[PDB]
Ligand binder design. Structure first.
Ligand code: NA
Length: 212
C-alpha cells in the first residue's frame, strides 16, 4: 500500500480522522475514500452524506470523518483528498486497526499439589474479550516459562463470541518439577495484546506445594 499514518482505534469508541489541507468550514472540495470490511473495494463519502452510511461514517463541518462507534469491520484504509482556497491539493492516508482489551486474565482449575519427577497439570488460564486474539503465556518465579523444554508443555485454545467476534483464549500448563527444586513455586499467567506498545495483563499467582 501507500505510506500511511497508523491509527489504532478501540472498538465501541468514536473515531475522528482529520482531512488535512481542507478549509475550516464549507464549502469544501474534499472527498473521503475508504476500503474496509464494510466495503467492496473503495467507497466514496462526500460532505453531504446521505443513506445508510450516515450511521457509520459521516463527514463533519471541518471536513473530518467521524465514526461514532468503531467496530471490527471498520479495519482498513481511509483516504481524504482536498483542495484549499488556493487550489493546492492535499492527501491524507490512514491505516486503521481496531482492538479491544480483554478483562483481567484468570487462572481456573489450579492444582494445589504437584509431584516432582512426573507431569502435573498446573492450571488453566482464561482471557475473555480481546481483539485481535493476542496470546497467553506462563511464568515461574517471575521468569518466562518456555513450552516444550524442561518438562514444560502447553495446550492452547481460541474461541469467538458468536455475536461480537471477540476472542476468548484458554491455556493449560503442565510441568514436570525437577527433584530437589523449590517446594513452593510461584506460577502466573499473562495476556499479551501483541499489538505494539499495548501493555500486558497479569493473573494473580498460584503457589502449589511440591512433593519430593
Ligand atoms: Na494504503
Amino acid at each position: 500500500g501507500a505510506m500511511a499514518q497508523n491509527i489504532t482505534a478501540r472498538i465501541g469508541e468514536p473515531l475522528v480522522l482529520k482531512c488535512k489541507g481542507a478549509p475550516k468550514k464549507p464549502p469544501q472540495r474534499l472527498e473521503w475514500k475508504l476500503n474496509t470490511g464494510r466495503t467492496e473495494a473503495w467507497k466514496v463519502l462526500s460532505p453531504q452524506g446521505g443513506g445508510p452510511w450516515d450511521s457509520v461514517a459521516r463527514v463533519l463541518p471541518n471536513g473530518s470523518l467521524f465514526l461514532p462507534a468503531v467496530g471490527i469491520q471498520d479495519e482498513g484504509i481511509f483516504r481524504c483528498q482536498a483542495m484549499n482556497r488556493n487550489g493546492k491539493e492535499t492527501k491524507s492516508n490512514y491505516r486503521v486497526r481496531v482492538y479491544q482489551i480483554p478483562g483481567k486474565p484468570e487462572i481456573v482449575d489450579s492444582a494445589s499439589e504437584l509431584t516432582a519427577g512426573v507431569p502435573n497439570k498446573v492450571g488453566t488460564c482464561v482471557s475473555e474479550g480481546s481483539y485481535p486474539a493476542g496470546t497467553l503465556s506462563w511464568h515461574l518465579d517471575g521468569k518466562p516459562l518456555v513450552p516444550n523444554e524442561k518438562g514444560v508443555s502447553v495446550k492452547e485454545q481460541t474461541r469467538r463470541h458468536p455475536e461480537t467476534g471477540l476472542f476468548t483464549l484458554q491455556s493449560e500448563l503442565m510441568v514436570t518439577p525437577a527433584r530437589g527444586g523449590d517446594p513452593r513455586p510461584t506460577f502466573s499467567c499473562s495476556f499479551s495484546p501483541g499489538l505494539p506498545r499495548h501493555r500486558a495483563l497479569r493473573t494473580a499467582p498460584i503457589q502449589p506445594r511440591v512433593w519430593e
